[PDB]
Structure formats: C-alpha cells, structure tokens
Amino acid sequence: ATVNQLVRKPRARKVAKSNVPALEACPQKRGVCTRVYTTTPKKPNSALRKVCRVRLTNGFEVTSYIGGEGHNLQEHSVILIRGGRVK
Amino acid sequence: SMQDPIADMLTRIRNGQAANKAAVTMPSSKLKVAIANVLKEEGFIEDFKVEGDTKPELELTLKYFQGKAVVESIQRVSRPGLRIYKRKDELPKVMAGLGIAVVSTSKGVMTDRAARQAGLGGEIICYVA
RNA sequence: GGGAGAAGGCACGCUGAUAUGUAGGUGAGGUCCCUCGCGGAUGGAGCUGAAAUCAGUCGAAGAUACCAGCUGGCUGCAACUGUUUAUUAAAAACACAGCACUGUGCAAACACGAAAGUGGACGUAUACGGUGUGACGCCUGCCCGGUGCCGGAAGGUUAAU
RNA sequence: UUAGCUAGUAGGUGGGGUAACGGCUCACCUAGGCGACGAUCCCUAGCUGGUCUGAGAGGAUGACCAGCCACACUGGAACUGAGACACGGUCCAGACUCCUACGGGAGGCAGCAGUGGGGAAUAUUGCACAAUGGGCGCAAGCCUGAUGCAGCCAUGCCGCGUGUAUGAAGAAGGCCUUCGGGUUGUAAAGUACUUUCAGCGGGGAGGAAGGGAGUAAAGUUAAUACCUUUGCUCAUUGACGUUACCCGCAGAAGAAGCACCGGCUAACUCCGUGCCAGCAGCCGCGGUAAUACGGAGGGUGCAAGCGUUAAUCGGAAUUACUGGGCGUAAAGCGCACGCAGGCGGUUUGUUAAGUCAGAUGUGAAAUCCCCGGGCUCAACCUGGGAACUGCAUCUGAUACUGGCAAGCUUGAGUCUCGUAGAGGGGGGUAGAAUUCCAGGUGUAGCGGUGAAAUGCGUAGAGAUCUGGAGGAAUACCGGUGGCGAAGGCGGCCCCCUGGACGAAGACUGACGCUCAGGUGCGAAAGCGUGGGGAGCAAACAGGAUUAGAUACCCUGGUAGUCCACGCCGUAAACGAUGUCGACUUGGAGGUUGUGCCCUUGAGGCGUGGCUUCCGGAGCUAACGCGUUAAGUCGACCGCCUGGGGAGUACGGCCGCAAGGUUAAAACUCAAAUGAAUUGACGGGGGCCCGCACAAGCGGUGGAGCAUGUGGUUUAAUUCGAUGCAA
RNA sequence: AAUACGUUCCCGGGCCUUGUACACACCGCCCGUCACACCAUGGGAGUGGGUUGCAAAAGAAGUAGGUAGCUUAACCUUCGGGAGGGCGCUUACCACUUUGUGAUUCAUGACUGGGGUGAAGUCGUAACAAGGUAACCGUAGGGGAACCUGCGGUUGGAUCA
RNA sequence: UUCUUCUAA
Incomplete structure (x- = not known):
C-alpha cells in the first residue's frame, strides 16, 4: 500500500463477468427447442420442474426454465428467453 | 534511520x-x-x-x-515520502478552521488563515488541533 | 554435442570496365648499416595472381560433358564404431564400455604340463580369474519348500584299519 | 505464461527527389539504433469536446451535436487539377451480378428512399427548394433525397385530460363475520353544475423578410447612354396549410391501466391446493389450516403507461489517491547480502529547478453551472456571465525540497585495551556404553507381552569374568543458559578463523536507510559417485492382535542414519509478528560488562549490553500485546482481496531425478471463517451419592400350568399401551 | 435371617474443572475408495479450420529509365534535316498468384486424468475429547480406501504425593 | 490387552 508500490503497480480493480453469457449482452434471444422434459430440483425442494433444452441463435445449447403452470411446447419450436437463474 | x-x-x-x-x-x-x-x-x-x-x-x-x-490532535501532512504543495485557494480549515494548519511558503512559516490574508500558497507541513 | 548437407531457395557462361593485373604473393637493380655475410634494413622494377562489382553479350539451357546425396513422416529391435557362418544367412547373433556376483594373500586363484617347469606376472586385492547382464535414464518386488553353494559339529550313519 | 528488437536499420558524406525539410531516395562510409520509464509481439479499438454515474475522488462511456481521422465491391496503381490517389472519375487484377448474334460487353446504396438477408429490434421507392445555404451565371436563373415538412413507434422527455359539487337509504350486490355486524362506500345511483381536449362548424397571425420588376434623383462620364448608389410604385414569393390562435356545437359525454402485499419494503383476509401444482432479487415458502402457490375480496404503489430482461455506475471503504489490511479471520519472502531504485543529519552561501504568486496567450462552439429572456407554462429555444480544473510564455518570490559549493559531529565508520561465549573450519585425543570376536566359570532356560508367540538356548545360551575389535554419540555439568541473521551449534586439546559488547580516548566528516531484479546461506528426508556401517531403523519378514489388521505390539531386518565431494532448495524454516529509526507508566528476574563507596563477608550507590516473566496507559473483533509494542510515529520492501476448484492445470524456468518455481481458468456453493459465551459431551481431571458395585440371601431363565404381549389364523380374532418409564 | 471390608471397576446422578470442529446436542459431528448419476475440464494417435512469420517464385496495370525500330500539324531550316513526340522495345518497382517450411489460435478426437456435486448404496472409521496409536508440517516408502510408517520440526496437544 | 457404526423433514 506504499505509494511507490502503487506507482510501480496500479490498483487492479477486479473484473466481473456475466452469469448469463449466452445472450451476449442482449435483452432477449431467439431459440430452437431441442428437448422438453422435467427435472427434479436440489434437496430443500421436491417437484418436477418443466424445462427445455434449447438451441439458440448463436449455436449455443442451453437449458431454460418453463415458467407458469402448463404449456404447449414441442421440440423444434421457436421460443424466446429473458434470463434469470433458477436457484 | x-x-x-x-x-x-x-x-x-x-x-x-x-x-x-x-x-x-x-x-x-x-x-x-x-x-x-x-x-x-x-x-x-x-x-x-x-x-x-x-x-x-x-x-x-x-x-x-x-x-x-x-x-487535541497533531498530524503530518507533507511526509518525506510524499510532499504536499497546495495553492492559496486549497488551504485547508483544520476542524472547520478552529484548529490551524502550518504552511511554509516563500514568506517563511505562518498559519493558513494568515497565508490566505497573505494571498499566497505553499507547502503544508502539518495539522495541529 | 547434435539432429542438419534437415528441409527449402538464389547465384553460376563469355566480353569489357573497375584495375589495359585489382586484392594479394614474390621480388630485383638502387640506398644505408655491416662484427661485411651462404648479411641486415630500405627499396621497389619485374613476374605471378584471386575474389567481387558494374555494363555488355550467346544459347532452349553456362555446377552444360565426365564427375557427383532422392528426400519426408511413424514404429519394431539393437545404444553406438565394430565381429561372423572362406563357398546359399550380416543380422535383433557376437563383441563392447558399463553393472553385479564369486574366487584369490603370491610359491595366489587358475591353466598347460605324469613331471620338472611355464603362463598368470617381473603384476600383489584401485590386482587377477570366472560367470551373468550389456551404454544411458528410471528402476529392479516376493518365495531357501526344492536343487546347488556356504557355514555348523552335538548326535545317527560309516571306509580302509 | 510477449525480453530481446533493428541492416536503409541508426548516423554521416555525396548525388537524386519533393511545394517544403529529412534513407524522402541512392551511393559510399560508420556501427550504430532501440528496449525493463515495456522495446518487441499478441489481443481489442476511430479519437476528443462530451455523455452516464458518483458528495467528491473517481468509474464507465463516445448513438444523436461538434472537432479531427479513416474508408468507398476487393486488391492495386497513377492520372488530372491550386487542391484527389477522387462514394457517385479513369486504368489493371479479383470476386459477384447482368447482356450478347458468344466475337464480346456492362456493373458497385456504408447518398435518399426502398428490397432481400441477418436479427430481440430500429420508420415512407412520402411530399416540397417557400426559407436557410451551396454550385455555376452580370443578372434572371438552374440544380441540390444538402434543407425544410408530413408518415411511422407510449422510443424518450415534458404539458393535458378522461369531469365538478352534492348525495346514507351507509342502496343493491360483492366480500367477510364473534352472524351482532363490518367492508366495498360519498363510492355508485340520484341531484345541481361544467363543456378543456378530441370531434364538428365557422374565423384567422407569424414563418415572406428579402429579392424581383417597372420608376425617380444622385454619382459616373461628352453624356441627362449604360452602369452604380439612394428614394417610389407594381406585383409577389409558403411546401408545410384545413397552420398558431379565435367563436359556435353538444353531452358527462368518446377517453385507465399495469405491478404489488412473508421479511427485506408501503400495503391481508378468505377459499382452493396438499414437497403436488408451484413460487422465487435474496432469505426462503408448498410434506391438508399457505398472509410467500392459485382464485376472490380488500389494500399499497405508479400512471398513459406499468412490468420483466439486458446494459453502466452507485450503494461497495468489496483494490481502500481521497479511503483498507497482513500474531491467529486471505495476507511479511526461510533468512542474509546488494545494484538499479526510492529515501535522506546538521549549518552557511549560492542557484531558483521543484514549489508559490502575478501577468499574457490559448484552452472552438455546443453542453453543464449562474443570472436573464422567449414560446399560455413546462420540456424546449435563447441573451449575458462564470467555468473550461490545463498548457505555453514573461515577471517575481525564497521558507521548504532539490542543484552547487563550503563547514560541523550527534548519525555512520576506524584506531586502543579488554570481555564472554555449544560462533566457525582443520587435526587429534579421551571415557562409559553398545555390538562383535575369543576364552574362563557355570546350567537350563533366555528373551519379550496385557497375555503370549515368533526368536534364542544343552551344538552350553543367558548370566558371569577376562581379552580384543569396530562404529556412533559425547552422562554429570546444563540452566524459562550461551552464540550465530536464521537454518543452527554441546567431551577435552591444538591450529586457523569470525562476530558481539564494554571502557577511556583519538579520528573520520553524513560516509545513511531500505532494496525489484540479482547473489549467497539454508533443517530433516531425498539424489549422485565414492567410503564406512556399532546402534537404530522406512520398506520388508515372522509373531501376535482383531470381524478384518497391508496398523498400533513383539522378534527380526535393508536402504537410510556416519564420512568425502557435489545436486536438490523445500520445513508449523513460527515469535504463524519484514527491515532501521525516534517517543512513551512500571515491577520482578537471568546473563554479560564497567565506575564509585571502606569489599568494614557473599555489601551499598551507579552506569552499559542482552534476555525472561508480570503488567499501567494505550491498542485490539476479542484473545492479547504491552519500552524487545500487536502503543505513538517515521522510511523502504514483500503480500492480501468469499470458499471449493488450486498453489492445481497449461507454458516457461531450474534440477540427475524427485520435483522446485511461476501461475490460472471453467464449474460450483452462500457460505468459509476468527475470537469469545452458554450448554452438552470426553474411552479428560478432582469430590460426593445411590441394593450402583462389592459383602449377602432368595430367585428368574429348565419343568408344568395361570396371565399378558408378539406372531400366525380367522367371518371376526374390537381398540389402545410396546426400551429403561408397554 | 445372612451380610456390608470397602468405592478399584460397573450403572446412574450431582458438584467444581478442563478440552471441544458438538448445539433436534457423542445414539454428536465427521472421512475416503468404491457403485450409480450429473456437471465442466486436463491429457490425447490424430483430424479440420483461421491467422501469420520466413524463404523464394510471380510481374498485369501503372509510372520511371533506356531504346535498335517504325513514325512524326506549331519550332529551327540548305528544305535536305534539327530537336522533340508517337508507337514498340527492354529495364526498374509492384498487385494478382505459387511454392515450401514454421508459428499461433479455434474446432474436433477413440481413449484417458482428476475435479465438483448427490434427501437411499458398499467398504472401513482417519480427524473433532488424551477421538480411544495426541495432532500437523516437510520429505521418503508402503498400502482397496480413508491412510500407515520412517526422519526432522511445530503446539495451533492432555496428564502430574 | 481388546473394542465399530446410527440414513433421509
């Protein structure tokens, strides 16, 4: 913290990354349904969370949670994702 | 040493x-x-x-x-590893002016409120409060 | 250290100029010293003579003939130079420096010799003989029951006597 | 985890070249040039005014406006011209598209529209040069997809509505309920009033001022030609346009919705739902009574919008310049040396560099700020101001920091006498012990363990004495001792050698500190050759042990431990506290000096060095530290930035190797963590008690039957209790 | 009736004390192979791209230089020519393009290395108390697995007529 | 001397 050390080396402010990189700084991105299925969550909760494996515009293959209760989703379907993790 | x-x-x-x-x-x-x-x-x-x-x-x-x-307080502003040279406008007010700041200018050694009335800045030594 | 001439690519004749011989090499006649000589300096005539540049110029092609490496990538095996089936087999075979074990105190061990004697060795354990392994790197586990070897002398067995 | 880079390179001379200077180019010399103040190489990028955030410091950012730059199918090159390497010029090569009679040609929206494409997503083959400009022309004019307008999107910022009063029967109805009521709710209904806007109908500025023609006079000239200048008339010029604004018209009319209510954070009930459906920024809700899911009611928040996602700062002092820390919560290199580096005692002059002050220049406009003005306000427009925190120059200033000289001696360093010491190497030398060998004596066990056993013994061990050999370590002293920077150093003697301290002095003149990179030292184990090998001892072997025992135990036993010379370079290398200063209450010691007082004995008064415990202030999250600071401040270096991943990967480095060293990322979690408190627990420690044990006696469990339970069976064997405490 | 010496041990309870990672509280917490599943990643015979160095080849257009040749309205002029220009010629530079060799980066890759993660498995129970062989650092060896053991160090360990 | 373990609200 001596200023000579501060002269020889600047304060490296830490660089943070996105947790949602597949959108690549976009609000929403178009996607293609690849597999629609359910998934049991981790220990404190017990459900069958409806979820779909998605091929995106940029070739990314991601999973994205189906909100709500009940849907009409097929594979090979055009959807749109907004973000947000599921805990 | x-x-x-x-x-x-x-x-x-x-x-x-x-x-x-x-x-x-x-x-x-x-x-x-x-x-x-x-x-x-x-x-x-x-x-x-x-x-x-x-x-x-x-x-x-x-x-x-x-x-x-x-x-109540005694400090050091211009340390030997880092010197302080402030102009007449950037002279401080120790404890909102109630304490004094020792500045050495070309007109010897005085306080900041005298140096403002002298109208010329310089090297701020220390803070005394 | 190498690999590696890795690979790959460029130049190459002739003529002229540079410089009608250049760089260089050799080196007189001169000149001075000289203990004067089968001298020393100086001195450069002479001869001899590369290499390069530049500019021309000829062909289809100028290392023109003769001469004179095909290169690359992976892997087996042996480290290598070596040695060999004279006369169908040249290697992965052998040898090898290296490693390990073992024997041996000199009149050595051992070998050739009925013997004497000789090699060992005119060497003396950092020496020599034998066996196995075969550079270097990393290493080298377990079993002595068996077979050998070594050590033991209590007892059993037992020769000539 | 980019360290070397450069040959026209770098410089010169000469020639050439350009508007201009110059390897600009060439020739010839010279070998220079550059780089740790980051060259080089890689990745990304138009730059600034500014914009956004922030209290500021800063951080991010460059759409719109500007200033600059670069580009124009791609790659090239010149041309022309004052100005080009030319979006809408040429020429060549390419690509692609198009035409062709197949000989050939043509083509460039990153102009304005638009089409396709891509995309989460960004508008009309819109109109009009009236104004503002720009090009040409004497003018008139001509052109302008520059420009002014309209459409398009709640894209944003503003301004405005969707009425106002009254109205309790607290209406109906809804919801809820203690069924009493409550709430929706003056809300609506109703009543009176208002007509903004939109609509409709009618009216009606500014942006149109200039200029244009016809005219008059003056100037100019021979001129009253012309022309120029200044007055006068005729006409104008509008795309927007049905403008801005003004009156009628009619009715409460035509005009409100999203999000939210578990806490965080403003606002709750009811019902469905039952770890399902789901919810979810975080903590976390749902496993039949959910204020957290879904619905309803009610309420909160905003509003022509409301939400979610993206994206940036803030909060975040969470990189701490302002404004952090490193004893244990992440963090001081294992120490020492030392260059560059940064830092500097004292005193006098000098210098005026830094620094400060003043003055000039510039810091474009816009923007922001301040004071105004204008649009009915506001947004917006705009006047003036300040500001633009700078830089350059000039004039000072002399306290400090430098620069330059001279000094001084406190810092620092010698000289002189001594002092203590496991300080270092080198070579000897002892004495016990152990082992081994040999012998005497002697006899039946020895050894080991919790028990044993493996083992060793009658082939005479063990034991006992005598002799000899070998390696290794040096009892007692010995010490919360000594020395060394540490790592560390332990018999005695000798040889060589280091460091420290004290004492009186003498001298030197600041000679100092720290130190990236570098250099050395650096435990143990390990490595390499050699040696040596008593004891001990990984591995290994046997014996136990146990459910198992690759362990703990036993009996063995090899590397290894020792030496010589080299490699490795890590240790909880710890005081988990980097080095050198200065200040700041004490007490009790240890060790080592050195004065004084009669040493009046092992005494007292001093004065040093080093070290141990305690402990005041102070500090600390506490614990603690506490003159040897974890107190107060100085200088410089090293390091830290949630946990796992991980000091690992991948490269480099070094090494014989082992590895050392440098050092991530992906992913994952909302914890990890430090001290300290209260319990609990301990195959932890004390103290006590109980038919708890021990001391006793009788039983149960064997037998038969009674009774209850389990199980089985039944049409049903009703249900409940089920360690102790059924 | 018998018997009680006694408090060593056993069972339980209380008290002081210490340790402590325990706190629905030692019937506690806790570890690592292994089995399964999930997630990203290292390595990897290779494979396919991108970018770029390097060495040369390449020579359109263009311009500059030279120019045998063909040619040539102003100007000189004896009218013959003079210079110049044109065209072509060649030279210089250089685009396109080619060759080899590297480098770098992305993608992919049989297989393989660990890592992290589990509301139930299997194996053992190492650490937390003296965790029942105190714990841990180095380093070495061994071993299904936590680990074990040797040497050295640390206390960030309990015990005490 | 020996002595191990207690799943998921």
Whole structure:
C-alpha cells in the first residue's frame, strides 16, 4: 500500500463477468427447442420442474426454465428467453 | 534511520501530551524553531527554550488546560515520502478552521488563515488541533 | 554435442570496365648499416595472381560433358564404431564400455604340463580369474519348500584299519 | 505464461527527389539504433469536446451535436487539377451480378428512399427548394433525397385530460363475520353544475423578410447612354396549410391501466391446493389450516403507461489517491547480502529547478453551472456571465525540497585495551556404553507381552569374568543458559578463523536507510559417485492382535542414519509478528560488562549490553500485546482481496531425478471463517451419592400350568399401551 | 435371617474443572475408495479450420529509365534535316498468384486424468475429547480406501504425593 | 490387552 508500490503497480480493480453469457449482452434471444422434459430440483425442494433444452441463435445449447403452470411446447419450436437463474 | 526531524518532533509532542509531561526536549533545527515560534504565538505551547552551542537543543513547555491537554490532535501532512504543495485557494480549515494548519511558503512559516490574508500558497507541513 | 548437407531457395557462361593485373604473393637493380655475410634494413622494377562489382553479350539451357546425396513422416529391435557362418544367412547373433556376483594373500586363484617347469606376472586385492547382464535414464518386488553353494559339529550313519 | 528488437536499420558524406525539410531516395562510409520509464509481439479499438454515474475522488462511456481521422465491391496503381490517389472519375487484377448474334460487353446504396438477408429490434421507392445555404451565371436563373415538412413507434422527455359539487337509504350486490355486524362506500345511483381536449362548424397571425420588376434623383462620364448608389410604385414569393390562435356545437359525454402485499419494503383476509401444482432479487415458502402457490375480496404503489430482461455506475471503504489490511479471520519472502531504485543529519552561501504568486496567450462552439429572456407554462429555444480544473510564455518570490559549493559531529565508520561465549573450519585425543570376536566359570532356560508367540538356548545360551575389535554419540555439568541473521551449534586439546559488547580516548566528516531484479546461506528426508556401517531403523519378514489388521505390539531386518565431494532448495524454516529509526507508566528476574563507596563477608550507590516473566496507559473483533509494542510515529520492501476448484492445470524456468518455481481458468456453493459465551459431551481431571458395585440371601431363565404381549389364523380374532418409564 | 471390608471397576446422578470442529446436542459431528448419476475440464494417435512469420517464385496495370525500330500539324531550316513526340522495345518497382517450411489460435478426437456435486448404496472409521496409536508440517516408502510408517520440526496437544 | 457404526423433514 506504499505509494511507490502503487506507482510501480496500479490498483487492479477486479473484473466481473456475466452469469448469463449466452445472450451476449442482449435483452432477449431467439431459440430452437431441442428437448422438453422435467427435472427434479436440489434437496430443500421436491417437484418436477418443466424445462427445455434449447438451441439458440448463436449455436449455443442451453437449458431454460418453463415458467407458469402448463404449456404447449414441442421440440423444434421457436421460443424466446429473458434470463434469470433458477436457484 | 533518521528520515525526518519534523515527524520526530510532532510525535514527541504527541506522546508527551498523553505522558502528561511538562517539558519535551529534543535537538533543535532552524526549521524546528520556525515551527515552534508559531505554536506559542498560536497558543498551543507555553514556552520553548532553544539552547545548545555545539548542538542546539529545543526544550518545550506543554500547555495543559483544566488538567487535561490542549493539543487535541497533531498530524503530518507533507511526509518525506510524499510532499504536499497546495495553492492559496486549497488551504485547508483544520476542524472547520478552529484548529490551524502550518504552511511554509516563500514568506517563511505562518498559519493558513494568515497565508490566505497573505494571498499566497505553499507547502503544508502539518495539522495541529 | 547434435539432429542438419534437415528441409527449402538464389547465384553460376563469355566480353569489357573497375584495375589495359585489382586484392594479394614474390621480388630485383638502387640506398644505408655491416662484427661485411651462404648479411641486415630500405627499396621497389619485374613476374605471378584471386575474389567481387558494374555494363555488355550467346544459347532452349553456362555446377552444360565426365564427375557427383532422392528426400519426408511413424514404429519394431539393437545404444553406438565394430565381429561372423572362406563357398546359399550380416543380422535383433557376437563383441563392447558399463553393472553385479564369486574366487584369490603370491610359491595366489587358475591353466598347460605324469613331471620338472611355464603362463598368470617381473603384476600383489584401485590386482587377477570366472560367470551373468550389456551404454544411458528410471528402476529392479516376493518365495531357501526344492536343487546347488556356504557355514555348523552335538548326535545317527560309516571306509580302509 | 510477449525480453530481446533493428541492416536503409541508426548516423554521416555525396548525388537524386519533393511545394517544403529529412534513407524522402541512392551511393559510399560508420556501427550504430532501440528496449525493463515495456522495446518487441499478441489481443481489442476511430479519437476528443462530451455523455452516464458518483458528495467528491473517481468509474464507465463516445448513438444523436461538434472537432479531427479513416474508408468507398476487393486488391492495386497513377492520372488530372491550386487542391484527389477522387462514394457517385479513369486504368489493371479479383470476386459477384447482368447482356450478347458468344466475337464480346456492362456493373458497385456504408447518398435518399426502398428490397432481400441477418436479427430481440430500429420508420415512407412520402411530399416540397417557400426559407436557410451551396454550385455555376452580370443578372434572371438552374440544380441540390444538402434543407425544410408530413408518415411511422407510449422510443424518450415534458404539458393535458378522461369531469365538478352534492348525495346514507351507509342502496343493491360483492366480500367477510364473534352472524351482532363490518367492508366495498360519498363510492355508485340520484341531484345541481361544467363543456378543456378530441370531434364538428365557422374565423384567422407569424414563418415572406428579402429579392424581383417597372420608376425617380444622385454619382459616373461628352453624356441627362449604360452602369452604380439612394428614394417610389407594381406585383409577389409558403411546401408545410384545413397552420398558431379565435367563436359556435353538444353531452358527462368518446377517453385507465399495469405491478404489488412473508421479511427485506408501503400495503391481508378468505377459499382452493396438499414437497403436488408451484413460487422465487435474496432469505426462503408448498410434506391438508399457505398472509410467500392459485382464485376472490380488500389494500399499497405508479400512471398513459406499468412490468420483466439486458446494459453502466452507485450503494461497495468489496483494490481502500481521497479511503483498507497482513500474531491467529486471505495476507511479511526461510533468512542474509546488494545494484538499479526510492529515501535522506546538521549549518552557511549560492542557484531558483521543484514549489508559490502575478501577468499574457490559448484552452472552438455546443453542453453543464449562474443570472436573464422567449414560446399560455413546462420540456424546449435563447441573451449575458462564470467555468473550461490545463498548457505555453514573461515577471517575481525564497521558507521548504532539490542543484552547487563550503563547514560541523550527534548519525555512520576506524584506531586502543579488554570481555564472554555449544560462533566457525582443520587435526587429534579421551571415557562409559553398545555390538562383535575369543576364552574362563557355570546350567537350563533366555528373551519379550496385557497375555503370549515368533526368536534364542544343552551344538552350553543367558548370566558371569577376562581379552580384543569396530562404529556412533559425547552422562554429570546444563540452566524459562550461551552464540550465530536464521537454518543452527554441546567431551577435552591444538591450529586457523569470525562476530558481539564494554571502557577511556583519538579520528573520520553524513560516509545513511531500505532494496525489484540479482547473489549467497539454508533443517530433516531425498539424489549422485565414492567410503564406512556399532546402534537404530522406512520398506520388508515372522509373531501376535482383531470381524478384518497391508496398523498400533513383539522378534527380526535393508536402504537410510556416519564420512568425502557435489545436486536438490523445500520445513508449523513460527515469535504463524519484514527491515532501521525516534517517543512513551512500571515491577520482578537471568546473563554479560564497567565506575564509585571502606569489599568494614557473599555489601551499598551507579552506569552499559542482552534476555525472561508480570503488567499501567494505550491498542485490539476479542484473545492479547504491552519500552524487545500487536502503543505513538517515521522510511523502504514483500503480500492480501468469499470458499471449493488450486498453489492445481497449461507454458516457461531450474534440477540427475524427485520435483522446485511461476501461475490460472471453467464449474460450483452462500457460505468459509476468527475470537469469545452458554450448554452438552470426553474411552479428560478432582469430590460426593445411590441394593450402583462389592459383602449377602432368595430367585428368574429348565419343568408344568395361570396371565399378558408378539406372531400366525380367522367371518371376526374390537381398540389402545410396546426400551429403561408397554 | 445372612451380610456390608470397602468405592478399584460397573450403572446412574450431582458438584467444581478442563478440552471441544458438538448445539433436534457423542445414539454428536465427521472421512475416503468404491457403485450409480450429473456437471465442466486436463491429457490425447490424430483430424479440420483461421491467422501469420520466413524463404523464394510471380510481374498485369501503372509510372520511371533506356531504346535498335517504325513514325512524326506549331519550332529551327540548305528544305535536305534539327530537336522533340508517337508507337514498340527492354529495364526498374509492384498487385494478382505459387511454392515450401514454421508459428499461433479455434474446432474436433477413440481413449484417458482428476475435479465438483448427490434427501437411499458398499467398504472401513482417519480427524473433532488424551477421538480411544495426541495432532500437523516437510520429505521418503508402503498400502482397496480413508491412510500407515520412517526422519526432522511445530503446539495451533492432555496428564502430574 | 481388546473394542465399530446410527440414513433421509
């Protein structure tokens, strides 16, 4: 913290990354349904969370949670994702 | 070892207040007297007694008020590793001006409120409050 | 250290100029010293003579003939130079420096010799003989029951006597 | 985890070249040039005014406006011209598209529209040069997809509505309920009033001023030709346009919706639902009574919008310049050396560099700020101001920091006498012990364990004495001792050698500190050759042990431990506290000096060095530290930034190797963590008690039957209790 | 009736004390192979791209230089020519393009290395108390697995007529 | 001397 050390080396402010990189700084991105299925969550909760494996515009293959209760989703379907993790 | 007599001086003032001593002595310098002749004038010490022939020794008298001390704070602004040169407009106000800031300009050593009325800035030594 | 001439690519004749011989090499007649000689300096005539540049110029092609490496990538095996089936087999075979074990105190061990004697060795354990392994790197586990070897001398067995 | 880079390179001379200077180009010399103040190489990028956030410091950012730059199918090149390497010029090569009678040609929206494409997503083959400009022309004019307009999107910022009063029967109805009521709710209904806007109908500025023609006079000239200048008339010029604004008209009319209510954070009930359906920024809700799911009611928040996602700062002091920390919560290199580096005692002059002050220049406009003005306000437009935190120049200033000289001695360093010491190497030398060998004596066990056993013994061990050999370590001293920077150093003697301290002095003149990179030292184990090998001892072997025992135990036993010379370079290398200063209450010691007082004995008064415990202030999250600071301040270096991943991967480096060293990322979690408190627990420690044990006696469990339970069976064997405490 | 010496041990309870990672509280917490499942990643015979160095080849257009040749309205002029220009010629430079060799980066890759994660498996129970062989650092060896053991160090360990 | 373990609200 001596200023000579501060002269020889600047304060490296830490660089943070996105947790949602597949959108690549976009609000929403178009996607293609690849597999629609359910998934049991981790220990404190017990459900069958409806979820779909998605091929995106940029070739990314991601999973994205189906909100709500009940849907009409097929594979090979055009959807749109907004973000947000599921805990 | 000896990187400053000034930071030696202010700390010997600082540790003498808490030690409740009446007389803090040290070897004297030309710049040391030029500061010590301000704080008597500004009313933060009572007496300084510069003596010594082969080597001048400055002996101070600490000002105490109502039992406790007068020097509530004593700092160092321009340290030897980092000097401070502020203009006449960037002169500070120690404790909203209630304390004083010792600045050395080309017109010797004075306080900041005198230096504002002198209208010329310089090197800020320390803060005394 | 190498691999590596890796690979790959460019130049190549002749004529003229540079410089009608250049760089260089050799080196007189001169000149001076000289203990004067089968001298020393100086001195450069002479001869001899590369290499390069530049500019021309000829062919389809100028290392023109003769002469004179095909290169690359992976892997087996042996480290290598070596040695060999004279006369169908040249290697992965052998040898090898290296490693390990073992024997041996000098009149050595051992070998050739009925013997004498000789090699060992005119060497003396950092020596010598034998066996196995075969550079270097990393290493080298378990079993002595068996077979050998070594050590033991209590007892059993037992020759000539 | 980019360290070397450069040959026209770098410089010169000469020639050439360009508007201009110059390897600009060439020739010839010279070998220079550059780089750790980051060259080089890689990745990304138009730059600034500004914009956004932030209290500021800063951070991010460059659409719109500007200033600059670059590009124009791609790659090239010149041309022309004052100005080009030319979006809408040429020429060549390419690609693609198109035409062709197949010989050939043509083509460039990153102009404005538009089409396709891509995409989460971004408008009309819109109109009009009236104004503002721009090009040409004497003018008139001509052109302008520059420009002014309209459409298009709640894209954003503003301004405005969707009425106002009254109205309790607290209506109906809804919801809820203690069934009493409550709430919706003055809300609506009703009553009176208002007509903004939109609509309709009618009226009606500014942007149109200039200029244009006809005219008059003056100037100019021979001119009253012309022309120029200044007055006068005729006409104008509007795309927007049905403008801005003004009156009628009619009625409450035509005009409100999203999000939210578990806490965080403003606002709850009811019902469905039952770890399902789901919810979810975080903590977390749902496993039959959910304020967290879904619905309803009610309420909260906003509003022509409301939400979600994206994206940036803030909060975040969470990189701490402002404004952090490193004893244990992440973090001080294992120490020492030392260059560059940064930092500097004291005093005098000098210098005026830094610094400060003043003055000039510039810091474009816009923007922001301040004071105004204009649009009915506001948004917006705009006047003036300040500001633009700078830089350049000039004039000062002299305290400090430098620069330059001179000094001084406190810092620092010598000289002089001594002092203590496991400080270092080198070579000896002892004495016990152990082992081994040999012998005497002697006899039946020895050894080991919890028990044993493996083992060793009658082939005479063990034991005992005597002799000899070998390696290794050096009892007691010995010490919360000593020395060394640490790592560390332990018999004695000798040889060589280091460091420290003290004492009186003498001298030197600041000679100082820290130190990236570098250099050395650096435990143990390990490595390499050699040696040596008593004891001990990984591995290994046997014996136990146990459910198992690759362990703990036993009996063995090899590397290894020792030496010589080299490699490795890590240790909880710890005081988990980097080095050198200065200040700041004490007490009790240890060790080592050195004065004084009669040593009046092992005494007292001093004065040093080092070290141990305690502990005041102070500090600390506490614990603690506490003059040897974890107190107060100085200088410089090293390091830290949630946990796992991980000091790992991948490269480099070094090494014989082992590895050392440098050092991530993906992914994952909402914890990890430190001290300290209260309990609990301990195959932890004390103290006490109980038919708890021990001391006793009788039983149960064997037998038969009674009774109850389990199980089985039944049409049903009703249900409940089910360690102790059924 | 018998018997009680006694408090060593056993069972339980209380008290002080210490340790402590325990706190629905030692019937506690806790670890690592292995089995399964999920997630990203290292390595990897290779494979396919991108970018770029390097060495040369390449020579359109263009311009500049030279120019045998053909040619040539102003100007000189004896009228013959003079210079110049044109065209072609060649030279210089250089685009397109080619060759080899590297480098770098992305994608992919049989297989293989660990890592992290599990509301139930299997094996053992190492650490937390003296965790029942104190714990841990180095380093070495061994071993299904936590681990074990040797040497050295640390206390960030309990015990005490 | 020996002595191990207690799933998921």
